[PDB]
Amino acid sequence: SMPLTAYQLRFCPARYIHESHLPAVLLRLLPALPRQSVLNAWLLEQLELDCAFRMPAQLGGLALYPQAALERTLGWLGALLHGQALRQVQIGEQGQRFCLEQLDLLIGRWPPGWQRALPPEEGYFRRCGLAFWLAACSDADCGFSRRLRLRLRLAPADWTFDEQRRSLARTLCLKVARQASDECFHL
Ligand SMILES: [Cl-]
Domain ranges, ordered by start, for the chain: 6-180
Cα-to-centroid distance, 68 and ligand 1 (Å): 11
Cα-to-centroid distance, 94 and ligand 1 (Å): 5
Cβ partners under 8 Å of residue 29, min gap 6: none
Q: What phi and psi values does residue 174 have, to the nearest 5 degrees?
A: -65, -35
Read off the DSSP letter of residue 138.
-
Q: Most distant CA pair in the chain: distance in Å? A: 52
Q: What phi and psi values does residue 112 have, to the nearest 5 degrees?
A: -50, -40
Rg value, the chain, Cα: 17
**Residue type at position 105:** L
Cα-to-centroid distance, 60 and ligand 1 (Å): 23
Q: What is the resolution of this structure in A?
A: 2.5
Cα-to-centroid distance, 23 and ligand 1 (Å): 34
Helix, strand, coil percentages for the chain (3-state, nearest 5): 50, 0, 50
Helices (H), the chain: 6-11, 24-29, 37-46, 67-80, 83-87, 93-101, 124-136, 142-149, 164-180
Q: What phi and psi values does residue 74 have, to the nearest 5 degrees?
A: -75, -30
Cα dihedral 119, 124, 125, 130 sign = negative
Read off the DSSP letter of residue 183.
T
Cα-to-centroid distance, 172 and ligand 1 (Å): 20
Residue 82: count other Cβ atoms within 10 Å of its Cβ: 20
Cα-to-centroid distance, 97 and ligand 1 (Å): 10
Angle between the N-to-C axes of helices 93-101 and 67-80, in degrees from 0 to 180, rounded to the nearest 10: 30
Cα-to-centroid distance, 150 and ligand 1 (Å): 24
Q: How deeply is 8 buried, as exposed, middle or buried, from its count of CB atoms within 10 A (0-12, 13-18, 19+)?
A: middle
